[PDB]
Amino acid sequence: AREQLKEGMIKIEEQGKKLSETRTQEELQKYVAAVATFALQAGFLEIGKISGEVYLKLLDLKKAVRAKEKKGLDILNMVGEIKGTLER
């Protein structure tokens, strides 16, 4: 019986780990590199206005990613407090 409760706890920690996992920037950096590569092939170096609009949107995209990363971090703190509350 006591062993069953111990395995239940590591199962909670396992599910909490994937819930709190963010890892968004690794996908973000790959995206920004793909856009910048396309920007080079299109000759971004009248097109200047297009190049300016792309970079401004990318900065807004990066903000949202950090915002999503911040909420993901808040989730990481909450699952830690739940594990602490369950230890008592």
Binding site: V32, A33, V35, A36, T37, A39, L40, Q41, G43, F44, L45, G48, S51, G52, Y55, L56, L58, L59
Partner: protein
């Protein structure tokens, strides 16, 4: 001659927040310099060189310091590192290293006569 807070988006969070106008390229406003430095964003975002973002901003938005009220450029090593990392990728797409950013015009680090920045 009075230090002005950097408003160019590409040059925020580089290490210093204050610059001055006009710069070495005789840009009267930051918006004029911003429209020209932002054309290098694909090279910066690909991250061909970690020193590219600092090198570009150190010239278009040169640092302004209350202790040293004289222009302080980047060291040649900063230029040479940024050049060695991104110029090959530039040449593959048909763009050469701009003459205005030639490293030989900058001072080398370790000279007591003139000071330069190398983070």
């Amino acid at each position: 001659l009075a230090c002005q807070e950097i408003t160019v988006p590409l040059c925020k969070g580089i290490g210093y927040q204050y610059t001055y106008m006009p710069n070495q390229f005789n840009h009267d406003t930051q918006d004029e310099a911003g429209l020209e430095v932002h054309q290098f964003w694909p090279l910066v975002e690909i991250q061909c060189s970690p020193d590219l973002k600092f090198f570009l901003c150190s010239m278009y938005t040169p640092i302004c310091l209350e202790d040293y009220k004289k222009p302080l450029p980047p060291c040649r090593s900063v230029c040479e590192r940024a050049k060695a990392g991104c110029a090959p990728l530039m040449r593959q797409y048909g763009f050469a290293w701009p003459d205005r950013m030639r490293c030989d015009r900058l001072p080398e680090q370790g000279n007591p006569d003139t000071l330069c920045m190398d983070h």
